[PDB]
């Protein structure tokens, strides 16, 4: 059993898209508002997120079939999935030795107490770091990593999506490429696919905790004035 | 002829308010998004402005009688006058030797070509720098400087102000303290007061050029996403 030419064409599209939208140098982090260690870290992490949303948008525009959805559907998927793809792509900088995200230098290494200084409580961040270690232990290939993002993003069980059936089609067609890639190209991966779908379920639970805490934060203007226009728009509500 | 105890009480209030809302160290400028030398300078200057608006708000809350206006009137005066008080208070860092604003170090020295890289054309910036040199040549005392701000801000000829007569009262009562301070405490100032009112008229002409160019800029989301929530709100239109 072997992968069709079009599922490689897909795999190729998804990894080139990820490489275009992900800077392994983290050299744009100097252009954020600097970190400061209430809510000292909120400015710097608000730009970090806003920047990442711009990257997630560029990645989605390159998933096959995404461009051809209606702009309303594209917005609904992005608004609902944005924080999830961020939690996913962020694993690439996460590291088990420091149990933090180590980007660029040490001014850009965010342990759990940095994110608390951006206005978040441990019941978001413990399942978050555990998500990231559980997923770091799954030791995904680059191909499974970009697939899991593309899949999470093209999920039709989102609030507000219209052409439900078409997205479910495209999502499944990407799940087939994944499950097929693990069987052929990943030794020891006969339990992996189910472990990935379980990570998607954890992403949902995180999504909701984060959406709740951000709500509390965005309704206090001393703090929401620290956010960026883009963040406010994507995590906002008036759709 | 000599100044009443209440006009000193006013002068005292206005300079202590200015000293509370103005950092001569410019040491908070490191917390802005760094300058970069399209529109490279827009992020750093957008935070510069947003920060300054926070300072102008703290200053107005300390002008005598301002707290007692209705919150709608306070908003209307701030929204219409914000960019003017910024152009005024900014003279304190402006310098004739460099013909730029030299705050803190040299990363925070803004010549005219820096502000062009934040999306503004010379027909705003030449009358701006000329405003600043004409006003730098008037060599105001600290007392006349804070007065001219308090006066510019409490002007009732603003779009959207309600209790017109009360603001005109308070503005005039501050003009009397000014004109009286120059006669008593400023030698050579028998032409000064009229020169100050003429600077208020230049501030209006600047206000409109800036309001026009910002309009063009705020209607392009690649650029307005660089602004801050506060800037968007104060220079916006939905009042």
């Amino acid at each position: 059993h072997m992968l069709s030419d079009e599922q490689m064409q897909i795999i190729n599209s998804l990894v080139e898209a990820h490489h275009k939208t992900y800077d392994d140098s983290y050299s744009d982090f100097v252009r954020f508002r600097p970190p400061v260690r209430r809510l000292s870290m909120l400015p710097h992490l608000a730009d970090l997120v806003s920047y990442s949303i711009q990257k997630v948008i560029g990645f989605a525009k390159m998933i096959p079939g995404f461009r051809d959805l209606t702009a309303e559907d594209q917005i609904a998927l992005l608004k609902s999935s944005a924080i999830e793809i961020i939690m996913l792509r962020s694993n690439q900088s996460f590291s088990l030795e420091d149990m933090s995200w180590s980007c660029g230098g040490p001014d850009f290494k965010y342990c759990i107490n940095d994110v608390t200084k951006a206005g978040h409580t441990l019941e978001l961040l413990e399942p978050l770091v555990k998500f990231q270690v559980g997923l770091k232990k799954l030791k995904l290939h680059e191909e499974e990593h970009v697939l899991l993002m593309a899949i999470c993003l093209l999920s039709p069980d989102r609030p507000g999506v219209q052409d439900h059936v078409r997205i479910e089609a495209l999502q499944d067609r990407l799940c087939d490429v994944l499950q097929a890639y693990i069987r052929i190209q990943h030794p020891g991966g006969r339990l992996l696919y189910a472990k990935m779908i379980q990570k998607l379920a954890d992403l949902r639970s995180l999504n909701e905790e984060h959406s709740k805490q951000y709500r509390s934060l965005s309704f206090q203007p001393e703090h929401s004035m620290q956010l960026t226009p883009l963040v406010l728009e994507v995590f906002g509500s008036e759709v | 002829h000599m100044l009443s105890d209440e006009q000193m009480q006013i002068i005292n209030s206005l300079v202590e308010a200015h000293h509370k809302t103005y950092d001569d160290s410019y040491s908070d400028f490191v917390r802005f998004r760094p300058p970069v030398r399209r529109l490279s300078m827009l992020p750093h200057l957008a935070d510069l402005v947003s920060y300054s608006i926070q300072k102008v708000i703290g200053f107005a809350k300390m002008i005598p009688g301002f707290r007692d206006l209705t919150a709608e009137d306070q908003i209307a005066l701030l929204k219409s006058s914000a960019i003017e008080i910024i152009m005024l208070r900014s003279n304190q860092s402006f310098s004739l030797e460099d013909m730029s604003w030299s705050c803190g170090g040299p990363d925070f020295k803004y010549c005219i070509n820096d502000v062009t890289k934040a999306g503004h054309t010379l027909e705003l910036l030449e009358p701006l720098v000329k405003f600043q040199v004409g006003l730098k040549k008037l060599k105001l005392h600290e007392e006349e400087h804070v007065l001219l701000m308090a006066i510019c801000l409490l002007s009732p000829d603003r779009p959207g102000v309600q209790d017109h007569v009360r603001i005109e009262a308070l503005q005039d009562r501050l003009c009397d303290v000014l004109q009286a301070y120059i006669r008593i405490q400023h030698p050579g100032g028998r032409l000064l007061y009229a020169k100050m009112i003429q600077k208020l008229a230049d501030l209006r002409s600047l206000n409109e050029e800036h309001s026009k160019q910002y309009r063009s800029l705020s209607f392009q989301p690649e650029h307005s996403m660089q602004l801050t929530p506060l800037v968007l709100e104060v220079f916006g239109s939905e009042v």
């Binding site: 948008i57 728009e233 906002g236 759709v239 | 307005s224």
Partner: peptide, 10 residues
Amino acid sequence: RHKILHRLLQ
């Protein structure tokens, strides 16, 4: 709304 979002998507 989604002025910025819609434009980033071209």
